[PDB]
Structures are given as structure tokens and as C-alpha cells.
Amino acid sequence: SRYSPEFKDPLIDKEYYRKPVEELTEEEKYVRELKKTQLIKAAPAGKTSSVFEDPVISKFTNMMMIGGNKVLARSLMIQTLEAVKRKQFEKYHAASAEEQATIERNPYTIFHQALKNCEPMIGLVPILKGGRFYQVPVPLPDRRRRFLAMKWMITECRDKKHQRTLMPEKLSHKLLEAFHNQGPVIKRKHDLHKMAEANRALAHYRWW
Amino acid sequence: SLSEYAFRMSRLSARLFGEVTRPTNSKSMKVVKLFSELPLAKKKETYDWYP
Amino acid sequence: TEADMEEYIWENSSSERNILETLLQMKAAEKNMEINKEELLGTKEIEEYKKSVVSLKNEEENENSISQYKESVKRLLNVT
Amino acid sequence: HYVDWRMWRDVKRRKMAYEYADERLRINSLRKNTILPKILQDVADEEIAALPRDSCPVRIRNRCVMTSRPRGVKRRWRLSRIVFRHLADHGQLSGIQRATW
Amino acid sequence: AISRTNENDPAKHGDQHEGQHYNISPQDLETVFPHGLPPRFVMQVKTFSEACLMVRKPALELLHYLKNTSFAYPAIRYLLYGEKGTGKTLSLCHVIHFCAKQDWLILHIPDAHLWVKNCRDLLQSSYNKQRFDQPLEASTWLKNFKTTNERFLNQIKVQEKYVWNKRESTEKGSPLGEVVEQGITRVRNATDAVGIVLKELKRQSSLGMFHLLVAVDGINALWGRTTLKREDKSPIAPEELALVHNLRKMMKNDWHGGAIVSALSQTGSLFKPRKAYLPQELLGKEGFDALDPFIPILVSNYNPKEFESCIQYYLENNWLQHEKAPTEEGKKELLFLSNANPSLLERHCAYL
Amino acid sequence: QGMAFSKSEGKRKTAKAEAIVYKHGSGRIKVNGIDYQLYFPITQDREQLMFPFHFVDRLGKHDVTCTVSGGGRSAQAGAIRLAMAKALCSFVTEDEVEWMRQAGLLTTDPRVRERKKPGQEGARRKFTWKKR
Ligand SMILES: Nc1ncnc2c1ncn2[C@@H]1O[C@H](COP(=O)(O)OP(=O)(O)OP(=O)(O)O)[C@@H](O)[C@H]1O
Ligand SMILES: Nc1nc2c(ncn2[C@@H]2O[C@H](COP(=O)(O)OP(=O)(O)O)[C@@H](O)[C@H]2O)c(=O)[nH]1
Ligand SMILES: [Mg+2]
Ligand SMILES: [Mg+2]
């Protein structure tokens, strides 16, 4: 990189800086004074201080971007958030006063939960033992679960099964299913869970 | 398309500035270019290329 | 022709022709026989209108010259 | 005393092409328009197709002036890349250095 | 509450209602606007299950002009202009709603850009061999015209015999709806039927039978260029389209008994840069001369009160689902990111 | 007219911006004589102009006149962001300046296009390697 190892990453958090000085601990106070001497990298053009900033949506947008086209990737994203909100408003208006209490209309709540229902708890690592590969059940770091959930959702939506369905349409449908613990991305999580339970006797192959 | 005035004016400017006045197609304007420069073979870089 | 001129002139133009016809129609609507062109196209109002359309046609169009043209036409056509 | 016979054949081509350039120009001009009658342009076609083949300027080849190489020549110096570099690398071409950026 | 007005009559709107949303009833919405509403505004009607339009100064000014209209004088041309997304189309719609509740005959052209662009079926007009007819575009409009003006389509009766083909012909005195029905049914005669409808309403409004509103949204299409090409790929001029040629005649003030309200639009236009919005910029020389004299009405971005009233109306429908949008810091960002532009705001709020 | 302003510069890739930040204003940014919303129709671009003023709680308090040239739309947005942030440092407290420095709002981004090398496809990309 064109940044030297000396440059530190920017911390873009309004409340962090507008925290009362008295509340700072002796350790927390020191680090704050140390940064007054450090070089800071320029804030990249993605994240800002806005209250509407969501790092999970931003990552999901980048994971669906093709060839640097972030204007199109984000337009698909906001069209999906809109399609979800409109599908949940139609469902709420046609629901009875009793059911209405249930229906979630916030698309950020739905999106966030929809992905959390797809995240796998264990994974499989091919381990070469005796010239043969074994799908050994292994715990996954949180990053990898969250990556896999997003990647499975995007790969599901980009499948060619869907004929002439636009991505905002496809993705809003798939996100709503996964919000109700249904659909093929929730299934893909269960198939992974079933494989790992079937090979539970091989977990001893792991050496970490 | 050009109005008669616009046409008769551009022909007057061409007469003044010494450009072709007769209507001439692009294929025949090569005659002007041919005589407007030197032949490649006549240019010094060409005929005097070698020491 | 008008297309060849690089400066707009109000005389013998469409806006001159149009605003003439419009006022004659307004006079006929009132059943007035004062149809003298010179009388119609002479008032101070027609002049302000003439300033606006020529100002529009010859200098940069901006929301100020559009507002000025508006108050001229709004005044010729008796729109309050 | 040219580098070789291929250079010598280009030396002659360049010289003949120079001798006939005015004639070739004049004849082309006749046949490079739509103004003139075709029966006349057809005579011109015959006339220029009858001029010696080594007066045709497309037959000139820009060879290294030092080593006669037919390709790899920089046109500003009329030298092949091998010969250009040899002078450039010893410091003998005014103002030319190795580029780094 | 503070964003809504109980005054649902578009005739009793004054400066006191500026910023407040009035409810267009499902009846008027189905009748007066079977077309012409902004697509993003038609989506909003569905999700909120109601059409509420903000009373704004541009429309207020027009209503004023159209209440003091002297039907004896020739038709005044009003022209709404403004930067992209400022509410020109919904200003024009506010007005149309007014005139429709005053029993004017409405001649609403939803989007004139559609008539110079993307034409599949371009037939050589039989009435005039030098022009082209657009059966699909002409038929669509007739159906919507019939919806809006169904009450008046019988009372009005043609004043001349119009021969469709060798066999069929409309006879003098027959009701106007019969001419519309011919176009709707035989789309081969839809363009010629539209010409006759315009030719009659103009002629008969001068006779004082009804008041006529000619409302053409995207009017700058009529004097520009088209993307339509002939068989030999040569471009067709708007003058040559029978459907445009006849609508042009409706824009001249040589008739009286009504008004001509129009709106400009760069969105959907042909060969106009993104930021062109001023009247001569969009109309061009030919188009400006065809409307001179006209009264320009400026439409701009929401002013601080209009902006706040919009947010409250979105909050009132629970549309702003994000947790921070009701906050004052949320509003500041909505305000910044939109610059109070009505369209940017709506588009931004459709996912926050 | 006696109005207080500071002006600063910003550079992002091949884009160069100059910003005049007025001590008092409404939130009006005028890029190259055009409203910021019309110069930058892309939202991400407008979100970058918000960033400096939002971070210090000054959205709607200043007027900005900037000029930018070079680069593409988004490099222009980031040059203007830097120019505006720097000019804005004159009207905030020294603690707010430091926080703006620690948010990365006051640094020139050094990431610029790397040259293609000869015998390669790209800056880094290699031609296909053929084992056999
Ligand atoms: N008076 C209004 N009441 C309610 N919403 C409005 C009003 N004016 C504008 N809006 C909102 O802003 C959007 C502006 O779109 P509209 O079609 O009215 O504008 P326009 O100026 O004709 O646009 P364009 O430049 O695209 O032609 C509307 O879709 C609606 O979302
Ligand atoms: N088929 C048909 N179409 C007509 C007739 N009269 C008018 N129209 C249509 O309506 C338009 C009116 O044009 P206009 O010149 O005013 O008609 P005119 O008054 O008969 O000369 C024409 O361009 C036609 O498309 C008619 O007799 N037959
Ligand atoms: Mg519009
Ligand atoms: Mg590459």
C-alpha cells in the first residue's frame, strides 16, 4: 500500500469523540492522547458518519458488485430494501388487527435477521488424511459465518433457475423466506448442519 | 442544408481565402492535397535517409 | 432569412406577429373596433414585452429573464 | 560500401523514387478525381503502371542506417533498437536516459 | 395532523393550506387520473392506500389564474418549469383535479414524450399520405380520455361527417363518444379519431358548450426531435406524426373558452442534457415561438415548511421505518442528501 | 461584504478542488457554479460532501463555494470533501479539528493509479503462465 505502516485507520464514530472526558478510564484516556501523535489514513469513500450507515448492508452491496460498478450494486440494494418494505406493507394492510401486531415492516430488521437465520454454526474443512479427503466438522469464526450467509444468499439469487426475474425482486423474495426460516438458503444451512453431524466421528481429525 | 445567403457567403469567403470555390466531392479534393504538399519520395527524410 | 441572422430582432418576428393577433382577439372579444396596428403595438406595455423576448433571445436565459418575461406577458394578457 | 546488398537495393529504390516523384504525382492527380473523363483516367492508369517498379515509393524500406536491419528501427534516429540502445547505453545520445517512474 | 388538510375540494385551497396534504378520493383518482400520475407517486398510493397531494405555491398560483379566467378572451398558455423532480407533474395534476371538479372538459396528455419515441407500429396515415399514424399511442390515449370525460362524451355531438372507410362513417350530429368508440375499437382509425376529437373540442368550446382544459405534460416533446425512423432509417420529424401535428394545433391561442396548462420535462426527453430545465432551453427556438406569449410558473424544491410537512406525512404513514429517521439528525441528513428536492426525498425515503 | 470565510485545497487522484467555506450559511454547496445535488447526481457522492459537516454537527450552518477539476465524479467528490474539511477547520474548535483528523477527514489519500509494467498485463496482473 501507499500508506506506510505508521498510518492508523480512521475511527469514524461521532459519539466516541463526544464522550465526556471524565467517563474515560485511565487506560481509555491514554490511548486517546496517543492518537494525537499518530498518522491517520484518509477515510475511504464508503463509510461516513451518517446515522443511516449500516456496515452489513455496505458489505452486502460490495459482495454483489460486478467490475467496480457500485452505482448499480447500490441501486439494486435500495430497490431490494424498497421491495421488501412494500411487500410487508401490503401484507400488513391486508392483515387483521390481531396479525398486524406481528408483521415486521422494517426492511433493515428483516434483512439483518434474514441473514442471521442463514449463518451456519459449524462448517466442513477437507482434511487430507491417508491420501483421502474427509469433510471434517469444524467450528467457524464469526466472520466466516457472516461471509457464508451473505455469499449463499447472493449465489442463490444469481442462479439461472430464475428466468427474467430482476435481482431486487429475487432478493426481496429470498430475504423474506429466510426471515421466516424457509427457502433454499435456509436449507443450504441445514444440509451443511446435517453433513457435519453425519461426520461427527471424524471431528478427531482436526488438530486445532 | 444551407440557406442561399449562407451558401453565397461561404463561397465568397472561400474565394477570398483561396479555397476551392467550385462544388467538389471528397474524392476530387485529393487533387488539392496532392499538390498542397511534397510527394513522400521528395521529402528529405526519404531520399536522404542513409548516410 | 431570420435563420441566418445571428441577432434576434423583434420587428417582423413571431412574437411580434403573435402578440399582435392575441390583442386583436382580445379587442374583438370586447367588441371594440380600435384595430389600428400602430395603436396596439405602441403602448409602453408592448415595449416591456418586447424588451423581455429580445432579452431572452439575445442574452443568457436565466430565471431572472424568465420572471421578467412573465410579468410582461402577465400584464399584456390582463392576468392578475 | 553500404552495409549489404539489401541496403544497396533500397538506396537505389529511394533514388529512383525521387527521380520520378513529380511525374508520378502529376499522373496520380489525373486519376485521383471524378472530374476528368474516364477514357483519359484509363490512359493515366496505364501510364503510371508503366513507370519502373522501383520508382514506386511503397517499395522503400526504412532500414537501420548502420546495420541495415529492416525491422525494429526508431524513425527519429533511423537506427535499429540494437544500434539505438548501444549508443543510448553508453551515454552518446544527447538527452536520452533510462526511464523509471 | 399538521401535514394534512381537511379541505379536499381543490377549489377552496388557499395560501393557508400551503404545505398540507389533501386527500384525492378513490373516485376522482379512478376517474380524473387513469393516467398522468407520476409512476413513483402511483406506487405510493398503493402502499399508503391513499393519494394525498401537498398544496404548494406553484399550483396555488395556477388555480388563482384559472379561477379568474376570462373565457371570452383567447386561451392563456401556462407553462410549469423547474429543475428535475421538483413537482411539475403533480402541480399540473393538482390543477387538473381542480378543473375536473368544475366540470371542465379535460384534454390530458399524460406524457407527450411517448409520442416521439419507441413506436413499434408506425403506419402511413391514410388521411394524409405525408404523415404517420400511431395506432397504439393513439388508442391508449382515447381509452383514458373516455374514462375521464364519460359524462360529457354524449352531450357533445359532432358537427360534420367523418368518413372512416368505404363502409363506416360518422354522420353529422351523432354523439362524440361514437367517434371515440371507433378509434378505441378500430385502432387503425385511432390516430384519425384523436385528430377529430381535438378538432371538435377546440371548435365547440369556442361555441361555449363547455370549458376546456388542455393539459400537456412534457410539452417540450412537440417541437423537438424524435427517435422514430423511416423504413430507410431516415429520422422522422415531429411535424410528420399525425398525432403530434394535431396536438400542436391545440397549443395555439386561436380558440377560447378554456385554458392551456403545460409542464416541461427533461426526464424522458430526446437530445436534451440532464440539467436543461429553462423554457427556451427545453423548448428550443421552434417550441418557444409556438407558445409565445405564455405565463411561466416556476416549480422549485421544498421550502423548509414544505420539507417538514413531507417528513411528517411519511412518518404519519409509518413509511420511514428506520429507527433514526424520526430524529432531528435523521431529518438533517434527509435534507442534505436531497437538497429538499421532492423527488430525491421520496426516492431516498422509499428504503429508509 | 464583511463575511468570514476560509478557503483550502484538496486533491484526490487526478482531481483538484478549492473550497471557500463561509462562517455562516444555510447549507448551500455550489460546485462549479451548480448546486451540489445537480453536479453530483450519485448519492454516494453527496454522502461524501455531508460527511465533513455531519461529523462536527454543522449541517445547515455554512455556505460552500467550491471548484473542482480532473478525475472522475467520485474522485471529485473526495477532493471537495478534503478541501471543505480543511477550510472548515477554521470555524471549529481545536478539539474538533483533532477529532476530524482522527476520523481521517484531513488526510490526503495517497492511493493513485499504479503504472503498468512491461511484460505484464497490468499494474500487477501477469500474462498467463504456461507451465508446459
Ligand atoms: N405536490 C406534491 N405532493 C406530494 N408529493 C409530491 C408533490 N410534488 C412532488 N412530490 C413528490 O416528488 C416527486 C416529484 O415528481 P413529479 O413527477 O411530480 O415531478 P416533475 O417535476 O414532473 O419531474 P420530472 O423532472 O421527472 O419530470 C413526486 O413523485 C412525489 O414523490
Ligand atoms: N379518417 C378521417 N380522419 C379525419 C377526417 N377529418 C379529420 N380527420 C382527422 O383529424 C385531423 C383533423 O385535421 P384537419 O385538417 O383539421 O381536418 P379538416 O378540418 O377536415 O381539414 C386530421 O389530421 C385527421 O387525422 C375525416 O373526414 N376522415
Ligand atoms: Mg414530470
Ligand atoms: Mg487489470
Side-chain angles (χ1 to χ4, degrees):
Chain A
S1 58
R2 305 311 305 281
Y3 285 108
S4 314
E6 297 173 0
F7 282 81
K8 310 300 180 207
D9 289 313
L11 195 144
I12 311 174
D13 190 18
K14 291 185 57 168
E15 71 179 9
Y16 163 90
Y17 296 101
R18 302 174 173 273
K19 179 177 178 183
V21 171
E22 179 180 15
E23 298 176 0
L24 300 178
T25 65
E26 292 292 352
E27 196 66 23
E28 199 176 359
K29 196 181 164 193
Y30 169 77
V31 62
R32 155 164 296 186
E33 287 179 27
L34 174 59
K35 290 184 74 184
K36 294 190 63 180
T37 62
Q38 285 173 336
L39 296 169
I40 312 297
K41 300 168 57 172
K47 53 195 64 176
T48 67
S49 51
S50 58
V51 304
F52 299 129
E53 179 70 46
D54 182 14
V56 182
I57 293 280
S58 290
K59 207 60 162 183
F60 193 90
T61 308
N62 290 356
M63 289 181 67
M64 79 198 309
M65 174 170 54
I66 297 168
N69 195 350
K70 194 175 281 190
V71 171
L72 176 55
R74 189 188 178 274
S75 87
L76 299 170
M77 185 78 260
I78 69 177
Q79 284 174 9
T80 296
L81 290 162
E82 184 196 5
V84 166
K85 191 194 282 186
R86 288 202 201 268
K87 285 169 188 186
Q88 286 300 105
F89 264 70
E90 179 181 30
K91 181 170 285 186
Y92 180 103
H93 191 261
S96 74
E98 171 261 338
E99 293 168 339
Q100 281 185 1
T102 305
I103 301 175
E104 186 72 47
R105 288 182 299 174
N106 190 327
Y108 299 97
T109 298
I110 287 173
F111 180 89
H112 179 265
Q113 188 171 340
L115 282 185
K116 174 178 288 173
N117 291 347
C118 294
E119 288 173 18
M121 301 299 175
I122 53 187
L124 296 166
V125 166
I127 287 189
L128 186 51
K129 188 176 185 289
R132 297 171 43 88
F133 284 96
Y134 300 90
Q135 304 304 303
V136 177
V138 297
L140 293 182
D142 53 339
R143 318 180 311 270
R144 183 59 176 169
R145 313 184 205 114
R146 296 188 264 102
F147 176 81
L148 281 172
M150 295 185 201
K151 191 179 174 181
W152 291 351
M153 184 68 67
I154 292 164
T155 183
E156 177 67 35
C157 289
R158 280 194 292 205
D159 280 352
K160 302 307 295 301
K161 165 181 173 55
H162 299 285
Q163 284 285 48
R164 265 187 49 193
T165 316
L166 299 177
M167 188 75 171
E169 305 161 350
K170 289 178 295 192
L171 188 48
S172 63
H173 178 62
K174 296 316 180 65
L175 286 174
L176 281 169
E177 274 183 330
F179 184 74
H180 298 125
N181 282 279
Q182 294 166 27
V185 190
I186 295 288
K187 182 196 169 54
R188 176 170 179 101
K189 176 204 179 158
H190 289 160
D191 294 342
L192 183 67
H193 283 185
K194 287 168 190 299
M195 285 286 299
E197 187 277 331
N199 304 353
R200 60 192 162 116
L202 302 181
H204 306 264
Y205 284 14
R206 178 171 81 253
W207 59 86
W208 62 94
Chain B
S1 64
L2 281 188
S3 176
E4 178 174 302
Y5 169 94
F7 176 85
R8 291 177 159 291
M9 192 64 154
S10 71
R11 184 168 63 180
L12 170 57
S13 73
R15 163 66 60 182
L16 291 186
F17 287 102
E19 308 162 4
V20 179
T21 55
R22 311 272 275 263
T24 307
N25 64 326
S26 183
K27 304 190 65 181
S28 301
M29 286 298 298
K30 190 168 176 61
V31 175
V32 182
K33 311 173 201 311
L34 283 177
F35 284 104
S36 183
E37 300 175 0
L38 281 179
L40 182 65
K42 293 288 287 186
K43 289 154 74 185
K44 183 179 279 295
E45 184 187 4
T46 303
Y47 71 77
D48 190 359
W49 177 268
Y50 296 109
Chain C
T1 70
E2 305 294 339
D4 306 69
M5 309 184 176
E6 291 188 332
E7 183 192 27
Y8 175 74
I9 297 155
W10 195 77
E11 287 172 20
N12 295 5
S13 63
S14 302
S15 53
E16 188 271 341
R17 187 179 310 107
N18 294 348
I19 195 56
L20 182 56
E21 178 77 354
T22 306
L23 295 184
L24 282 167
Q25 296 284 60
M26 289 178 58
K27 288 286 178 298
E30 299 161 17
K31 299 194 62 48
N32 181 9
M33 279 189 312
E34 295 187 304
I35 59 175
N36 175 29
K37 296 175 297 303
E38 293 80 322
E39 168 186 18
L40 279 175
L41 300 179
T43 72
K44 60 179 66 177
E45 289 181 357
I46 287 282
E47 193 56 40
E48 192 202 352
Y49 170 82
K50 171 181 175 172
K51 285 182 182 190
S52 308
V53 303
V54 174
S55 182
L56 281 171
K57 297 265 190 189
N58 281 326
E59 66 182 1
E60 295 301 328
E61 187 188 34
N62 53 39
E63 65 181 14
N64 192 87
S65 55
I66 289 292
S67 300
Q68 178 186 338
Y69 167 85
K70 183 197 186 165
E71 298 308 324
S72 305
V73 173
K74 194 172 167 189
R75 190 160 195 156
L76 279 175
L77 303 184
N78 294 333
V79 169
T80 179
Chain D
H1 283 117
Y2 288 86
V3 179
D4 63 5
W5 298 90
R6 281 158 212 175
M7 181 177 284
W8 177 240
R9 258 177 287 150
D10 194 49
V11 169
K12 298 162 64 181
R13 281 177 186 116
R14 280 164 189 291
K15 176 194 310 183
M16 187 188 291
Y18 184 81
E19 299 164 7
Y20 287 86
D22 281 345
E23 188 175 3
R24 291 189 73 92
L25 183 64
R26 291 148 178 172
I27 300 181
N28 289 319
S29 68
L30 299 160
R31 56 195 292 275
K32 243 63 178 183
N33 56 83
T34 194
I35 304 312
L36 271 58
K38 284 167 288 188
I39 56 170
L40 181 61
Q41 292 177 357
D42 287 352
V43 176
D45 289 352
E46 170 61 35
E47 286 171 349
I48 200 162
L51 298 178
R53 318 204 63 265
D54 267 354
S55 58
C56 304
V58 293
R59 291 164 69 84
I60 288 164
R61 185 83 182 193
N62 293 340
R63 322 188 55 105
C64 188
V65 300
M66 300 284 182
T67 60
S68 195
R69 214 173 186 275
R71 282 183 273 216
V73 305
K74 298 296 294 177
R75 190 157 197 173
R76 179 166 196 175
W77 307 269
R78 312 181 193 173
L79 295 176
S80 86
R81 53 178 182 84
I82 297 89
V83 171
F84 174 95
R85 283 196 60 216
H86 190 247
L87 296 174
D89 286 345
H90 282 106
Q92 292 183 8
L93 303 184
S94 171
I96 294 173
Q97 59 203 84
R98 297 298 187 87
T100 49
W101 71 110
Chain E
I2 56 183
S3 57
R4 312 287 279 264
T5 179
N6 306 347
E7 192 54 66
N8 290 343
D9 186 24
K12 299 177 60 182
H13 284 138
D15 295 351
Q16 63 273 2
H17 301 127
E18 182 197 350
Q20 300 166 2
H21 285 82
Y22 86 96
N23 181 223
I24 307 181
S25 85
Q27 297 282 8
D28 304 336
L29 193 64
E30 288 192 72
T31 297
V32 183
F33 311 103
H35 63 301
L37 282 176
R40 304 282 301 184
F41 185 78
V42 175
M43 297 176 198
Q44 159 169 323
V45 170
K46 292 277 179 182
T47 58
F48 300 177
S49 310
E50 75 198 348
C52 292
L53 204 58
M54 192 191 307
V55 189
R56 301 181 61 193
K57 280 178 174 173
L60 283 174
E61 179 180 6
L62 272 175
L63 301 178
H64 187 255
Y65 296 156
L66 291 197
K67 288 168 189 175
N68 304 334
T69 176
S70 182
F71 298 114
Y73 292 167
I76 306 293
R77 310 186 214 81
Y78 309 84
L79 187 64
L80 297 155
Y81 76 102
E83 303 169 354
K84 200 185 190 76
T86 48
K88 298 174 292 295
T89 297
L90 282 178
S91 290
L92 185 61
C93 283
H94 197 300
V95 163
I96 296 162
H97 190 230
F98 164 72
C99 298
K101 300 305 293 162
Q102 301 293 326
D103 295 286
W104 297 37
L105 200 75
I106 306 295
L107 198 79
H108 185 30
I109 309 295
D111 181 29
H113 294 304
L114 300 177
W115 291 3
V116 288
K117 169 182 58 177
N118 301 129
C119 190
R120 278 174 150 267
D121 299 323
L122 198 53
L123 313 176
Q124 183 186 18
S125 179
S126 300
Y127 183 89
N128 183 335
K129 304 312 293 175
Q130 306 298 332
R131 301 207 211 107
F132 295 89
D133 64 79
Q134 308 187 357
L136 180 64
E137 287 79 346
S139 181
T140 304
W141 181 82
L142 279 165
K143 301 169 178 174
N144 291 327
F145 173 72
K146 179 182 179 183
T147 300
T148 304
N149 294 304
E150 194 172 51
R151 55 189 57 176
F152 304 132
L153 261 183
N154 290 349
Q155 165 186 350
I156 295 172
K157 286 156 194 180
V158 299
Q159 304 178 178
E160 155 178 0
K161 179 186 173 178
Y162 306 98
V163 172
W164 306 117
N165 55 353
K166 308 172 178 177
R167 335 297 163 90
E168 305 142 10
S169 167
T170 300
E171 311 309 300
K172 180 182 302 177
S174 56
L176 179 56
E178 191 185 30
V179 170
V180 178
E181 292 280 36
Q182 179 72 11
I184 293 174
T185 310
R186 321 297 207 284
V187 293
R188 181 180 154 271
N189 300 152
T191 300
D192 294 335
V194 170
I196 294 161
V197 167
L198 301 181
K199 165 180 176 57
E200 287 292 359
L201 300 185
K202 183 177 180 182
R203 165 203 301 174
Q204 301 196 13
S205 61
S206 300
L207 300 172
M209 296 182 62
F210 45 86
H211 299 322
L212 180 64
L213 184 76
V214 180
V216 179
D217 191 10
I219 185 177
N220 50 290
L222 304 191
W223 299 273
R225 296 162 61 189
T226 74
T227 44
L228 311 186
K229 275 82 69 178
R230 290 164 189 273
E231 294 181 352
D232 60 327
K233 304 301 293 298
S234 304
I236 296 165
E239 177 190 28
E240 294 153 331
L241 307 173
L243 203 59
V244 165
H245 167 95
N246 280 300
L247 189 63
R248 264 184 165 107
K249 292 200 292 285
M250 292 303 301
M251 311 321 296
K252 312 165 58 178
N253 53 352
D254 67 86
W255 61 281
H256 67 105
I260 307 178
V261 185
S262 295
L264 294 174
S265 198
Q266 193 276 327
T267 300
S269 64
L270 294 175
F271 307 107
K272 293 291 169 171
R274 171 174 67 88
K275 276 177 295 215
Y277 89 94
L278 285 167
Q280 200 174 339
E281 204 172 4
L282 281 183
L283 283 163
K285 295 177 72 65
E286 168 82 23
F288 186 99
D289 297 340
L291 291 179
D292 214 349
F294 61 90
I295 308 190
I297 314 285
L298 176 63
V299 189
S300 49
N301 296 339
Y302 287 149
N303 62 54
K305 183 213 295 189
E306 288 169 354
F307 174 80
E308 182 56 45
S309 170
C310 190
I311 297 304
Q312 278 306 308
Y313 175 77
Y314 288 156
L315 286 171
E316 187 171 359
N317 293 264
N318 303 299
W319 190 232
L320 284 175
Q321 279 293 327
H322 199 285
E323 302 78 0
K324 288 294 191 63
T327 318
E328 295 181 4
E329 195 178 9
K331 295 177 187 180
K332 289 170 193 172
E333 301 192 11
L334 299 167
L335 180 64
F336 183 86
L337 291 180
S338 61
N339 207 14
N341 190 249
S343 197
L344 290 177
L345 188 58
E346 182 268 326
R347 297 184 98 95
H348 184 53
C349 297
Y351 57 93
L352 277 176
Chain F
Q1 321 187 15
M3 295 175 175
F5 70 88
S6 52
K7 67 185 291 174
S8 193
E9 276 74 63
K11 197 186 295 187
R12 182 71 164 95
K13 294 193 185 169
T14 55
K16 293 167 57 179
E18 298 185 354
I20 293 162
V21 178
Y22 285 90
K23 182 179 183 60
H24 307 292
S26 307
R28 305 171 48 94
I29 309 185
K30 208 167 297 178
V31 190
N32 287 330
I34 312 171
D35 280 356
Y36 67 102
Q37 55 156 2
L38 297 169
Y39 193 87
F40 297 113
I42 309 297
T43 314
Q44 177 197 358
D45 278 345
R46 293 188 302 261
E47 292 166 356
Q48 289 285 283
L49 307 179
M50 189 180 74
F51 185 25
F53 298 98
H54 185 254
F55 185 80
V56 288
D57 289 289
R58 287 177 171 268
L59 277 180
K61 296 186 188 173
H62 302 273
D63 279 356
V64 181
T65 293
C66 46
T67 61
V68 70
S69 64
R73 64 177 177 85
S74 77
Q76 289 189 334
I80 287 169
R81 183 188 84 177
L82 181 58
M84 287 185 319
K86 282 165 147 193
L88 180 65
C89 280
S90 305
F91 303 125
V92 295
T93 79
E94 290 186 9
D95 296 357
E96 277 177 333
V97 172
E98 183 49 33
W99 304 338
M100 272 200 298
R101 200 193 65 86
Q102 297 186 24
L105 279 159
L106 301 174
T107 299
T108 310
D109 204 312
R111 299 175 298 149
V112 297
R113 183 203 174 258
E114 179 181 312
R115 53 166 297 191
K116 176 186 170 305
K117 264 72 63 179
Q120 303 181 9
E121 196 270 347
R124 304 294 177 91
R125 177 85 184 189
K126 307 298 185 303
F127 295 132
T128 299
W129 172 66
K130 331 161 192 181
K131 168 65 150 305
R132 63 189 54 84

